Amino acid sequence: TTALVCDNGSGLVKAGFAGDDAPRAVFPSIVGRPRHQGVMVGMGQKDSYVGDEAQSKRGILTLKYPIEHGIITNWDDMEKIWHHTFYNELRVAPEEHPTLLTEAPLNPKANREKMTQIMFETFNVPAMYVAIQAVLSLYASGRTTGIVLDSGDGVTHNVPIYEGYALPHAIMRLDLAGRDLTDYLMKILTERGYSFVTTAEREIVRDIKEKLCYVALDFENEMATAASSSSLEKSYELPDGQVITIGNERFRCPETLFQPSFIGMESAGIHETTYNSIMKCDIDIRKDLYANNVMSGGTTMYPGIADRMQKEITALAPSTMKIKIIAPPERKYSVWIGGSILASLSTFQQMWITKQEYDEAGPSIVHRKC
Amino acid sequence: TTALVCDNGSGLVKAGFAGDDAPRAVFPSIVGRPRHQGVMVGMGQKDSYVGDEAQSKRGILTLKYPIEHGIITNWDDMEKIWHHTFYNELRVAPEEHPTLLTEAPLNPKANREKMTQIMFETFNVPAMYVAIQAVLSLYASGRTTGIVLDSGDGVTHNVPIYEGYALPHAIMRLDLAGRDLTDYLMKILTERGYSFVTTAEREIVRDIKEKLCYVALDFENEMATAASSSSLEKSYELPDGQVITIGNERFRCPETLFQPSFIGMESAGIHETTYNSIMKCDIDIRKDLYANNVMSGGTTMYPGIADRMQKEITALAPSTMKIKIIAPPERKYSVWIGGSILASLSTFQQMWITKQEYDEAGPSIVHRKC
Amino acid sequence: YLMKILTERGYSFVTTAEREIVRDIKEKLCYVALDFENEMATAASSSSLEKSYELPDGQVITIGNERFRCPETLFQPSFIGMESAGIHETTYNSIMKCDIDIRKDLYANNVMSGGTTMYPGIADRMQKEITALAPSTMKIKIIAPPERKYSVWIGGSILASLSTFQQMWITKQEYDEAGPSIVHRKC
Amino acid sequence: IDWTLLEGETREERTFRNWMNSLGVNPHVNHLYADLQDALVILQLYERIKVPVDWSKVNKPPYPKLGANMKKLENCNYAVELGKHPAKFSLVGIGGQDLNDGNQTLTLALVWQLMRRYTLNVLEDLGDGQKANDDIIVNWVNRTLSEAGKSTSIQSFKDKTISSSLAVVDLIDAIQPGCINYDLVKSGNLTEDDKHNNAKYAVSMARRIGARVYALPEDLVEVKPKMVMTVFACLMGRGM
Ligand SMILES: Nc1ncnc2c1ncn2[C@@H]1O[C@H](COP(=O)(O)OP(=O)(O)O)[C@@H](O)[C@H]1O
Ligand SMILES: Nc1ncnc2c1ncn2[C@@H]1O[C@H](COP(=O)(O)OP(=O)(O)O)[C@@H](O)[C@H]1O
Ligand SMILES: Nc1ncnc2c1ncn2[C@@H]1O[C@H](COP(=O)(O)OP(=O)(O)O)[C@@H](O)[C@H]1O
Ligand SMILES: [Mg+2]
Ligand SMILES: [Mg+2]
């Protein structure tokens, strides 16, 4: 009938139908289990909480993410989220819809193979496909040339594409994304005396990060600005009514994207990783890659992150090239939007991994067809 | 019915209609094929890139020349260039036009036989003819006496003609031309740290050839001038914005024409090859040949090439002859220009190889009629 | 490239200290396949090519297919995105650029040196690949001494101990006059 | 009918553009390298040259804002595919993305072969079968004009007497006596400039009777022999 587009990120699940312009279901990719003692009869019958109900009852739960750094680490909890996606949030029978799934590059091969076997044997989909997330972000931009910087909850990765051809040797992947920024904001919030330890309190710090944090155009003068004045101070009200104030941690947290040494990592920032990915490409295609730096994912939604990238790559570029970052306001769903474009094309209808092909080749068919 | 004049050399294709004074289509004779992985649907459909498009998208292609040293080495890719020439660049049906083709002297006989078979059995031309390039370059100058130095991309050859009579025993041929100067410039550019390896980077070095290289009048004083001062230094901007500087390789690259031992060849330079061809001619026609040295082809376009041939031959000549180099500004199309002159003559209309003659004698007809 | 293809099994090495671990894995477990397409079919069926390696922290990683796919980049540089030809074709192309009279003696003396020529099966593969490119009446002979890793040093101690070499040094007096450019004349 | 000269446009592109509009494509082609990029006009011209087009494989001009370029790129891939196998054109090195990008050389490499096929079909339905000839159609006009009787008779298409449109307007009313209309015709008092007006005066009514003439008036004022024969070939079909 119609195809399902499911983008399983580390943090959020984006699901919907091919041909729409926005996902129908966006809920956190968590599973919660009660950690206290049930005393009222008839109220402890529920063994697990999955979607937004795991988030609303998080005070009495321990929260687990099945996906970490793009790799599915819990396969029983992943089937819970897929059951929640198909039957509760989209309310469709998966046996009638081909399903399009997404994955990051440079990812273990058993990950792609297991989600193929899950969809065919547990959910019994007629066909499926696994696409690369950065390729789909280029579909959403209406482009066939450009280097994509995708930064979500688990993985930051770069994929150069020129005229619809990918250069895999230039694909660069960094395991630094939003969940690592949230954990660093927790670590530096203790400097002002605010302590967040519980997995439920980690969801609070993520809410603080998405509201008050921003990228400084020049990091060393924001530090001098915040040291002398209090014009960067901002307040946040906790769920119990307490009020916390941060002035310096607002831009020290996203600065880990450009200085990964803040969290003790030896890697280079996202500006140098993009430039190094371009310099691994043929000298003829570099001018077009400099002019199409496509941004994607929720970790690129900080205020002032495209101004900071445009300034940092310009300092590394040969001063004759013109640098252009395309950061659309719909960045958070570019991977999903591009997936619904791809699954709607009639030229794509012969590239599904049909169940017939899976029955004769097994779960390894996904490596040849994707 | 207007005749077609296709002067396809090792480097470029020159095509047009007999009667015009300049070729209508001048594109590189290359065929590119994608070397990378196609990821976006609807973009991997093109299997071959032929004309200037292969030059536009060379970043993702491996570029092959179907012609090497005047000899067609890839007959499947040579038909692509001819199909592109007739249908895309000229937009004529070959079944209605006699086609004039060119070829270098002392060339394998199967090359001329097989390009006669292609023209009759694949393109189904009404008539065709194969002409020697150095003879056509003499029509273009409006002469009937002279010795032609033809230097293109693959072959350098000398042909002496007197009163419209060729002296075949004095015909010279040197397999050292523009392409071998490109490969020498790539090799000596690494002395400054500039590395060009791929087939797409050879096109960048050829571009540096045609814009910055010149012929030294006296090689040993230019070498001492460039060593002391810095006035011969020049800069060039690569496609990605990097700036390279060369000061000494400008005149050492074309010096290989006069000292073929720079690339490990035992042959003599072009100045001693044209002189050896004169000394193989009858003593009575030598004075006329000394005063008509006709240069043609792109490799004769270096600044100072004609003043150096004048000086070098004068040192070998008997000091009472007067040496005259004829280097018209339209040198690059003399072979094509002279072929449009020849195909326009009414005297020539009985010299075509018609299809009826080919149907009774096969491809060998070209050996007796041309 | 071994680091890049180790992530297919879930082994992530990203730091400059972890690159020294991958170098150690390469030198101990990698080998050149005589026929690449048959070894790929062999590893895809059984697990007799699998081997284990213990990391400095005690973790044990297993590779079965990356063992010969890593040195295969020498013969197929397109694995790492390069357009160049393999070391067997580059060696053959160097011979074909030489005088036709000296090619028979070059075919019979193919000398390898350096650490990257120390993979098990590298000389058998070069022997087989050049033979397929040679005119079938020549004799291809690869010379791979067990002391390959120090051939450049060993030959430099032979050269520097010769008495005829003692006039080929660039002395300090020569450098004091011509400057650092003296090295281009004497060497 | 539009007869105007653009600032930059070669005579080859004017002939192709005029042939498209005079053939009845649903949009009005104003720029060749800007109106063919969705391949809808090209797919329409395939029907005019007896090439079957499966319209279930074509994306209709209402395009979603998301993935519109991929929708148009699929159309260009179908147009190039139909040119190779069933149309038997020679399209070497041409893909769908060349039409979609508006490549000037490779767009003209396809449209000139469409026009050649269209003219070839005009020259074959005039006869019984697979015969196409020029001197059969030149004495036809010299014969059908004797029914009324007028001093207009040409030897071939290269004659300079058809420099003015007096010879073609002499034939335009022989088939249809209801289009006499010699009000604006000129005879004997014509310069080089004023015969452009009657050339348009003659070509314009050819579509009124039913002769689908796709030649420019400039192709008639001068004696371009390949386009003037199309005018008489298109007039024969309306006549007989
Ligand atoms: N406006 C925002 N500012 C800063 N961070 C944000 C914003 N919106 C979302 N994020 C972060 O982005 C991450 C989710 O991004 P997303 O692309 O949905 O991840 P995934 O690819 O795993 O679904 C979360 O870690 C969240 O904290
Ligand atoms: N201005 C220039 N200066 C020096 N060399 C040139 C110049 N223009 C073209 N060339 C050389 O001319 C060659 C092509 O010449 P051409 O006469 O077309 O050869 P062919 O007859 O083989 O096609 C190229 O290899 C290029 O290096
Ligand atoms: N047994 C082995 N098998 C495979 N590779 C090896 C082996 N021993 C050394 N190498 C590789 O060869 C290189 C040895 O360095 P060497 O040959 O001395 O190079 P260089 O001359 O540049 O110093 C190292 O990079 C190492 O990775
Ligand atoms: Mg994501
Ligand atoms: Mg030539």
Numbering used by the authors:
A (entry chain C), B (entry chain A): 5 to 374
C (entry chain B): 188 to 374
D (entry chain F): 388 to 627
Copy text verbatim from the article accompanying this structure deposition:
Here we focus on human T-plastin, a member of the plastin/fimbrin family of tandem calponin-homology domain (CHD) proteins. T-plastin is a 70.8 kDa monomeric protein that functions as a key actin network stabilizer, strengthening and promoting cell protrusions by localizing to lamellipodia and filopodia. While most cross-linkers bridge filaments through the dimerization or tetramerization of subunits featuring a single actin-binding domain (ABD), plastins contain two ABDs (ABD1 and ABD2) within a single polypeptide chain, each composed of two tandem CHDs.
We obtained a 3D reconstruction using IHRSR as implemented in RELION 3.0 (54) at a global resolution of 2.6 Å. Local resolutions ranged from 2.4 Å to 3.9 Å, radially decaying from the core of the filament, facilitating direct atomic model building and refinement for the complete sequence of Mg–adenosine phosphate α-actin and T-plastin residues 388 to 630. The map resolution allowed us to unambiguously identify them as CH3 (olive) and CH4 (dark green), constituting ABD2 and a short segment of the CH2–3 linker (light green) at the N terminus of CH3. The essentially uniform ABD2 decoration in the dataset indicates that when T-plastin engages F-actin, ABD2 must bind first.
